[PDB]
Write a protein that binds this DNA or RNA. Sequence first.
RNA 1: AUUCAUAAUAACUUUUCGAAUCGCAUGGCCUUGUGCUGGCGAUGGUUCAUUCAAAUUUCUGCCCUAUCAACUUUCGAUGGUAGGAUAGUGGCCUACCAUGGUUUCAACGGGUAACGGGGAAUAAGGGUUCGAUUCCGGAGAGGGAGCCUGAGAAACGGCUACCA
RNA 2: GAAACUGCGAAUGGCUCAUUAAAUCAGUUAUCGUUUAUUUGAUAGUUCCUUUACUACAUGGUAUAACUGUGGUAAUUCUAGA
Lengths: 260, 218, 134
Amino acid sequence: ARGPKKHLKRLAAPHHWLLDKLSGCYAPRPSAGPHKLRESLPLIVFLRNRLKYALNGREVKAILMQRHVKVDGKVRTDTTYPAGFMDVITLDATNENFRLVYDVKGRFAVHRITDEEASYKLGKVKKVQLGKKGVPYVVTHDGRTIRYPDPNIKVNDTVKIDLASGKITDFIKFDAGKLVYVTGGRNLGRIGTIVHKERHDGGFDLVHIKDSLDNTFVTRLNNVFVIGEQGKPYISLPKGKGIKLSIAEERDRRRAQQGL
Amino acid sequence: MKLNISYPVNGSQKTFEIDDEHRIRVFFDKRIGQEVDGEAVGDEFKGYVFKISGGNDKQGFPMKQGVLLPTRIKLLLTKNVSCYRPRRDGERKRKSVRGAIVGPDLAVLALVIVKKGEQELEGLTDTTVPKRLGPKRANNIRKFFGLSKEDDVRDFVIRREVTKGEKTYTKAPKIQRLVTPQRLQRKRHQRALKVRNAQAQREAAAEYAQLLAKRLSE
Amino acid sequence: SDAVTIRTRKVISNPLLARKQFVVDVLHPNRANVSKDELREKLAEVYKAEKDAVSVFGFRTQFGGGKSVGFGLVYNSVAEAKKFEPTYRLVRYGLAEKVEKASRQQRKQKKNRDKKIFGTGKRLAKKVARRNAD
RNA sequence: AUUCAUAAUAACUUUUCGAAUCGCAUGGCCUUGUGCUGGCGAUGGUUCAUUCAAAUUUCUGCCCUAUCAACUUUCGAUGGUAGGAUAGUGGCCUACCAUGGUUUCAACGGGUAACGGGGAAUAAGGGUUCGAUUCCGGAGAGGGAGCCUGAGAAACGGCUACCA
RNA sequence: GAAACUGCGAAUGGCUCAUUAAAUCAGUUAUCGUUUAUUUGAUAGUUCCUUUACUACAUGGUAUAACUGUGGUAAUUCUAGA
């Protein structure tokens, strides 16, 4: 096409933004960044399509010009920034400490955290590599890069890096028993266990998972995201917990929790 | 034709109307940049000598240096070359143009005086036209007033007074390349940060090696 | 003109814009209408503005009438309102002056005309004026 | 899973890079220079990674036609060796060598009033017809070829030649 | 703060569907077969010289527009000299 696309149409946007068919032709086209745009969420969306603190991109960009935001400990003023999973976002003037994570519906759940735990996030490890000068370095799901880690970290693990210094802290491996978040697909948002792994060398290893309800479900390895140990979340969890109700049970909860 | 001559020492420029066939013929067969003594062309110009600079044809098409064969021609063109303003970058374009060479197809021709003759040329030689700017860079000022490395040019600078309707005020340029305590602070920042970060990375690698030593100890 | 049960629903405090944003629900049962400026007055009268930090704009009436619904804002600092809110509402409220600018195609024609003239112009000018003189 | 990552060694380089750049600020300490230090943020820059992409690419899949049964290698058709060229693999191209490759499980050719798909209509089921057109992908900017710029174009509301 | 120089972009978008019959295209792979402006994260003590009478580093140089004014052309997003 003689070049990349600086545009995005509505009805091509991610369905998990809960936008409308209508209100125009075009849509925000997330900028470059750590989070892949289908995997991501814009600032305007978190605000204007999840918070309703504002209406228009005018108001949004005005707010960002006021520098009202940090993101993982840093301001970012692009309306089309690609926010995403396990981000940390904090507001000062309202003193809101958020963290980005899906619903069990796979929708980027509004999970408010405290001032602490807006002091730590996780990074699942994409690759660890013997960088040059013999240096070891390693990168994360959220587009960062660190050197001199703990070497016992290995691929597919996660780590509790701190936030702003960087600075890996104690971390979590991948073996039987651990606790997990799901980051893609039909089981998206779900939470469970390691119960076994179906290693398929050459490609597409899978992981059998079991939620608290002994609902088993098996997923792609790459969508795996360790989050602590079983009965031991290293973070704060939203509502729903990746427990994956039936629509029947959901209905039941609607009509029941409705009333009084 | 008409003749457009400059006296660069004054900054003067002046046009004349030269319709004597015989005096005009003195320039045929010549090219740009050749020198010619205008004594044949006027006792007023006796002793004067001029270097051929340029000319336009009877339809406005110009000449150019090294573009021979005294006629009109289309050439493809680029940036950093006269007779053409490239409009968007990369653009290369064809245009017509007249030859380098003197010929009767030139309503106008333009020169610059090389050497002054005996006479004076009133409108051009008499008037002394001023240069529009002075130096701007500090080193330019330094050469311009014969200043040392130390001489503190700041006061030497030119200023231009300007009246409001009554309120007069001076205006002057803004020195670039000037050394300042800020620039010194900047290099200070840079140097300090460089060696600091180096030693930071050094000790980090040290801790890493320590851990590694324990791993083999175990 | 019997009375008005105006109500303010869905109240949010917005420190990152320094405003209170809510939904106006008017029960104006046998009047006709709404009249935003009257609303402006009652709304500074019930939260606090000194009217002009309050903005209101989606005030459609129910089928049959007697009720209208819109959105309402009350900002902190009328100056802050005057910097954040857009100018068409300020002119609607008389709190600003709508600029008298030219039509789009006139501006465009002008741009396309000036798309030819390299540079200052006034030296294009002294020579087009001389050559035109003769 | 690698001649990977990376390191080290000996040399090479019309020598790449390593900040002569810009805005807010003003601090300290004396050996009192204008000393030496010293914050905030702005833009740039090597490599790596990421992101946005792009390019090639595996497998399966298409309407009619045998009144197209043979096709493919003049001049690369299939493959090998080496080389160039490319961002880069590759007959992509060039050299030498081979004689292979496809085909009734329909090739090759021809037609299509053929851009494909998402889908639309029709309604038992099974199906039939259409789908240029609000999304995705692809091609084109009167027809063709070439090309600079630029990370990215064979651009066309950019250029060059021809044809109309 | 006109104007211009510099920088970026103008290759997106929008329009149409002529071509195109394993070709595009759908789904599905792959790059241990490649490039990647931008965004983001990190990333730079060594740059000199037969190594005492050394070499702007408190920073080194021109070459040009914008500008001047000389002008040209039936005519243009034409442009010449100084």
